[PDB]
Design a protein around this ligand. Sequence first.
Ligand SMILES: Nc1ncnc2c1ncn2[C@@H]1O[C@H](COP(=O)(O)OP(=O)(O)OP(O)(O)=S)[C@@H](O)[C@H]1O
Ligand SMILES: Nc1ncnc2c1ncn2[C@@H]1O[C@H](COP(=O)(O)OP(=O)(O)OP(O)(O)=S)[C@@H](O)[C@H]1O
Lengths: 55, 684
Amino acid sequence: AASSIRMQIDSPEELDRLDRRIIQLKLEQQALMLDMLNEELSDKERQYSELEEEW
Amino acid sequence: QALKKYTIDLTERAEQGKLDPVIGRDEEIRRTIQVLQRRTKNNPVLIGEPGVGKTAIVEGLAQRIINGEVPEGLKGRRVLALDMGALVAGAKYRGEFEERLKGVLNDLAKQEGNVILFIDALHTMVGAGMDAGNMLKPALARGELHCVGATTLDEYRQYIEKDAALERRFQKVFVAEPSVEDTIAILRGLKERYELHHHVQITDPAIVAAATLSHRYIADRQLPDKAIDLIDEAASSIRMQIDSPEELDRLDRRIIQLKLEQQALMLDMLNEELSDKERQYSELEEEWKAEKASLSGTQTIKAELEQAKIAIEQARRVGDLARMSELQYGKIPELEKQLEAATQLEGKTMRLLRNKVTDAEIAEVLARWTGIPVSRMMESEREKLLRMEQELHHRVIGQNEAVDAVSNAIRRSRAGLADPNRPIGSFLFLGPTGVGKTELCKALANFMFDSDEAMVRIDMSEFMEKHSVSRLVGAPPGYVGYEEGGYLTEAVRRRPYSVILLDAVEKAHPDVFNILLQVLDDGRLTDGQGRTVDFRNTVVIMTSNLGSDLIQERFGELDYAHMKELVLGVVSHNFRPEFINRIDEVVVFHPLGEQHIASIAQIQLKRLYKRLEERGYEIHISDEALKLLSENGYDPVYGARPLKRAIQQQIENPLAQQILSGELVPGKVIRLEVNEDRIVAVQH
Ligand SMILES: Nc1ncnc2c1ncn2[C@@H]1O[C@H](COP(=O)(O)OP(=O)(O)OP(O)(O)=S)[C@@H](O)[C@H]1O
Ligand SMILES: Nc1ncnc2c1ncn2[C@@H]1O[C@H](COP(=O)(O)OP(=O)(O)OP(O)(O)=S)[C@@H](O)[C@H]1O
């Protein structure tokens, strides 16, 4: 149980969801080079940076 | 640096792509990570049956280390598999082997726990050269050495929990056999791997049929290994079927035959026939080369697609930006669409050939692994199987009921409708003496294999004591007959799809019936060594004669079902209730009547004709002599054998008498016409 809590502290899920989302939208925005995705990606990067600093 | 000398860097092979995509297994990899970070017991050992992907799960842990799905304390570790081989390959002197091994251990202490060591075959590791693993012992539970074990189920019980000196180190990780659909999920990342090596395409119905039929029928080995075996071996089957052809062989033999014929004739016409067949041969050769070139281009471009996927995972580890969108949205969909253009092109052009792997291929490959007809219905075996009643009545004349029940049992096992928790049919042949019980079982053996003596016929009347269970099942370990094992639990583990006759079962001592309860409950049977044999492809038939007085008394003027219930109560007096609760169908015979005995007389006279035709004496018979046999070889108390040995006596004694006399020359037809009482053999 100590190892389980050590894993859940040291390693989060929403950060993985946000990182996959920003790299996927980075793929799409690099493909499109209509956009709107600079703005969406900037919002999700700001949210990711906030959650990262809180972590 | 001995680390570069005698270790396999699995992180190197993980980054180089020399490993395999591990699918699922999040729970067990997570529990391995748990045991890797404790205070004491910092050495997980994996416990699984042999062939459930233990090394695969360790390499999947290694790829999650590379991909960074681990906690931060494991980010940057090194996975080193200890090379057993190169250490031994130069050893000559006193402990120079262990000198190298101790140098590697001092280098691991130098690496200060930043290297996660992995040594599989842990039961072999404990003695491999103070010998090989108890040099290590203080460094294990102190944060110095973190060797990760991975070893077999029984050998864990051999060399680990018995050797309790190191037992406060390692931890059980029961790597279970994954289910059917999980193995389907495994192969859908390994379908793509096996298509680079066998140059053929694999179809998803074949994968789901491979997983299901492997999990049901091959009971020695286990998932996920056996499904991989079926897929790989059927890929080899289709690779060979492509790599031949057949019409080229026909045309080549024909043109070299007509070439020799025309060269002999040097009327002709064979210059013209030869030129026509040579043009046909050139056409088929050019079509064959075109199909080979088509498959070559398809496989090269599919390998290009796979290397594109490998390079884009390399970029995902690296993190280039335009390379990602470039490789993805350029390379992947255009190679997929021209790969499928090649797929429909091969759907157009492959005529001569099966480019792909169907589920019938898995059926054939499995049917050569065991013998169970998982093969689809051809014309021969299907028409042979539909006339089951006519075949068994053209050996076992008489006894409609058991033939009906047995025919229905084997049909319900070929069509798949049989429960895979019980055997195909557990039968209990009651009835009086001499009425074709053992010949019904020989009739099934001669239908199923085309052989009378191809059935595990264990007579039960050798089992009249308490060491009889040691005879049939096996001998417990460390005794005299440990090396051979039993006669039943070995003669089925070789040959699954067979018939197991237990003749005269009531004469045996009832702990043998405890063993038969274990058989008809599980289908797996435990021997002295320990491993079990799946009896769910066999047909256990037990004969007896327990109700002989009651059936010979009362089967006349009584119905069928109440007779079955009455003699079943008699059996409940003899057997156990939990035993005969576990029987498919207790078919109960009837004594043989006159028309039946006339037919049995005709069968025995036919086999006598075959014997004296191999001897070289053709024999006709008058039907009055058949009536003499019917009136001498008939009585209800004994069944059919008075007929057989009355035939033996009254025919064969004057006949073989005169054949030894030299009176009867071969060539003429012996007419067995009647005497006033005897049967004379005449020559005319
Ligand atoms: N999760 C998985 N993902 C992909 N392939 C797998 C997976 N599990 C097993 N396999 C395959 O099954 C094979 C089993 O390899 P091994 O781990 O060597 O087998 P094993 O269970 O370790 O038995 P031994 O002792 O090593 S012979 C692997 O090499 C893979 O091809
Ligand atoms: N319908 C039948 N067709 C052919 N042979 C038969 C038939 N019924 C009986 N027999 C003969 O019966 C003989 C006795 O064989 P068995 O099967 O051993 O006798 P059973 O009546 O089935 O019972 P037991 O206990 O084995 S003596 C065989 O040699 C067969 O030739």
